[PDB]
Structure 1
């Protein structure tokens, strides 16, 4: 059993007041006061981020940890925060974004955020059974939290396998994907296998809540995976009992228009 497995048990052992205080302590949070109401009322002319996902991917790129270029696929696009982010980047030529939609799942938000015309959104699509196609950059932000760590491990394993399938079609593709439960040993095994064939490493973004162990794998970086995970587990355990609140920052505004 791993340090992260213990963290998950400690998390589930929090009382409600402990949990809600722990969840946001010391994390960056975008200010979505305006963006949320614009989306609620159905405004389509807006470039404020359609979700909290945009600033996460932006941070990864600003840090130099991802390469976003060429023909991009967004697997599990949800509202589309990553799709709109990618579409606004000059090195990106097109975005093919796929998400399952349906009951209890986010459908793509339709806005004029810069480069929207270069995105082909397709909802009602299961990416786990969809045959891969050519792409220069493969993104996947899939991984639904579960109180059950074994379920999170299995959901993570399916994402890593999907990425192996997209790399089999596109061996030279840039990859960035969510690893929901990197602390699970079955996930560590799959990541080692991925890293030994494709390179890459794991990083934590500062916008992820403390209630999730999610980390992001990118082929553009390197680093011992076990060490990366254990450093993050300790950080998450050390924040229990922290009284600092979240740190509020402006939300990404990409502007509007076609490219």
Structure 2
């Protein structure tokens, strides 16, 4: 059992009040009041983030932790927050975005955020059924939380394997992907082998709730994986009992227009 495995167990043994107190204490949270209102009105002419995923990728890019460039693929794009962010970036030439949900909350949201015209959204697609094609940047934000740590670990290994397949197709592609359960030994071993073939490292974004151990792997950074993970498991464990609330910050506005 790792530090992260104990974090999972303490999280599962929270009452409902304790869970809600814990999940957002000390994290950054974008104020989505205007974004949510426009989305629920059906306004399409807006650059505000279509999801909270947009600020996570923005944070990684503004820190210099990812290279978003060329032909971009978004594997598991959901509402499209990463797709829209990427399509707004200068070095990005096009985005092919794929997601399984065909309608509802997790289908792509269609807005005029800057560079929207460079995005091709393919809903109803399972990316594990897809043969990799050419890409300069591969992004993947897939990994569904589960109370079972072993299930989180396997979901994470499936994403690492998918990234290996796209990297075999595109050996010099920049990669950025969610690592849902980096605390599992089987994930660390798969991720260390990825790191030893392709380079890269693991980071925690400050917008991630404490109710998930997710970290983001990028080929553009470096650092010891086990040390990065241990630091974050310790922090997640420390935050149990922490009573500071979330820290509200402005939501991303990428502006509107074609590129």
TM-score over 0.5 for the pair = yes
Report deviation, 1:102.
4.0
Unaligned runs of 5+ in 1: none
Deviates most, 94-103 or 109-118: 94-103
Change (3 A) 1:5 1:104: farther
Task: Write out per-residue CA displacement over residues 129-176 of structure 1, whole angstroms, 9 at most, x where no aligned residue.
Answer: 100000000000000101111111111010000000000000000000
Rounded to whole Å, the distance in 2 between the matches of 1:180 and 1:172 is: 24
Task: Write out per-residue CA displacement over residues 12-67 of structure 1, whole angstroms, 9 at most, x where no aligned residue.
Answer: 01111111001000000000001001111111101000000000000000111000
Rounded to whole Å, the distance in 1 between the matches of 2:151 and 2:188 is: 15
Residue 222 of structure 1 aligns to a residue in which SS?
A: coil
* 2:174–2:219 Cα contact (<8 Å) kept: yes
Change (3 A) 1:119 1:104: closer
- In the alignment, what sits opposite 2:49? 49
Report deviation, 1:105.
6.4
Rounded to whole Å, the distance in 2 between the matches of 1:161 and 1:240 is: 33
- In the alignment, what sits opposite 1:19? 19
Report deviation, 1:103.
7.1
For 1:199-210, what aligned pairs fall within 5 Å after superposition? 199-210=199-210
Residue 96 of structure 1 aligns to a residue in which SS?
A: strand
Change (3 A) 1:103 1:186: farther
Rounded to whole Å, the distance in 2 between the matches of 1:37 and 1:95 is: 27
Deviates most, 76-85 or 9-18: 9-18
Deviates most, 99-108 or 114-123: 99-108
TM norm structure 2: 0.99
Rounded to whole Å, the distance in 2 between the matches of 1:199 and 1:257 is: 35
Residue 42 of structure 2 aligns to a residue in which SS?
A: coil
* 2:79–2:105 Cα contact (<8 Å) kept: no
Give RMSD over aligned pairs: 0.9
Residue 128 of structure 1 aligns to a residue in which SS?
A: helix
Change (3 A) 1:258 1:103: closer
Rounded to whole Å, the distance in 2 between the matches of 1:103 and 1:5 is: 34
* Corresponding position: 1:169 with 2:169: yes
Unaligned runs of 5+ in 2: none
* 2:138–2:175 Cα contact (<8 Å) kept: yes
Rounded to whole Å, the distance in 2 between the matches of 1:161 and 1:44 is: 36
Rounded to whole Å, the distance in 2 between the matches of 1:40 and 1:194 is: 41
* Corresponding position: 1:101 with 2:110: no
Residue 232 of structure 1 aligns to a residue in which SS?
A: helix
TM norm structure 1: 0.99
Rounded to whole Å, the distance in 1 between the matches of 2:140 and 2:56 is: 13
Rounded to whole Å, the distance in 1 between the matches of 2:223 and 2:104 is: 36
